[PDB]
């Protein structure tokens, strides 16, 4: 396909490590065309069937939507490098930790708008994300977020999954929108653990008896009953991506009715002058 592009271990090179997960190791890399004098920073995530691998590849170089992140290239020999575009700001959820503070209102609304239309891209392309979590959201401007690791997951987290899936392994779009219930939930609470405390193995159990997550002190009624419908027992109840697009829309055009945060009338908006230049450095593609 003319979307993922192979590429020769001689023509990148691993400059600096970035984090790790239980699937593989990020590096912050520079691709160096051949012929060619620059040096162009890429990001790289070297993996802990070559054909397979190839498969799934290709469909992940198919998304083509704003707020999600492609695929762009691949080395397949002494272990899977992954190659995409470098974010320098990092993931959603190291952001929210270290301005938990300077954040607004119609920030976290809009983030909030935007997962759900990378998530809803997903799924008219029948493709269930199965990762869904702050820390699989990275931020390419701070007025721009993009769901990440879409395909890793089939290619190679108890406290996001929804109950079907960890009694089961049933992982439907509907079990995604548990899962995003649970990333709403994190960025409400500036970035804490989801069940802070409990082991994992007893995640199912609590879930069984009607616990969910407690209500997060900056939000009003209305947002926590969205997070909660999220996490019904009947995966068919749980809200479409859809109808969480229009829901989340209508509440950033009034952030202060439905986030109480204190200061959201002194922290920054986005601007017409400073989205204009991030755009020219940073984000040029269509919106
Ligand atoms: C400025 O720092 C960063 C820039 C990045 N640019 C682009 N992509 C990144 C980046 C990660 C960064 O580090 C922040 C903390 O690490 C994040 C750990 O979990 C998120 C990993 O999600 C990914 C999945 C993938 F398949 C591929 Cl290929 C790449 C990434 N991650």
Known sequence: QALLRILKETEFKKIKVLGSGAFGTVYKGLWIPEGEKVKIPVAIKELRANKEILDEAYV?????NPHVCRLLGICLTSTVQLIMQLMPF???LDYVREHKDNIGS???????????????????????????????VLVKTPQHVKITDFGLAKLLPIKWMALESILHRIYTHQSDVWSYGVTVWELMTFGSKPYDGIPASEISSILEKGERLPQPP???????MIMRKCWMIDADSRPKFRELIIEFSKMARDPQRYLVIQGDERM????????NFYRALMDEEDM
Not at 218 to 224: A, E, Q, S
Not at 268 to 275: A, F, I, R, V, Y
């Open 106 to 136: 119609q920030y976290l609304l809009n983030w909030c708008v935007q997962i759900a239309k990378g998530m809803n891209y997903l799924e008219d392309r029948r493709l269930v994300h199965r990762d869904l979590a702050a820390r699989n």
């Open 268 to 275: 920054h908006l986005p601007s017409p002058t400073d989205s």
């Open 60 to 64: 992940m170089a198919s998304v083509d």
């Open 218 to 224: 900056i939000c009003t009624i209305d947002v926590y």
């Open 90 to 92: 990092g993931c959603l």
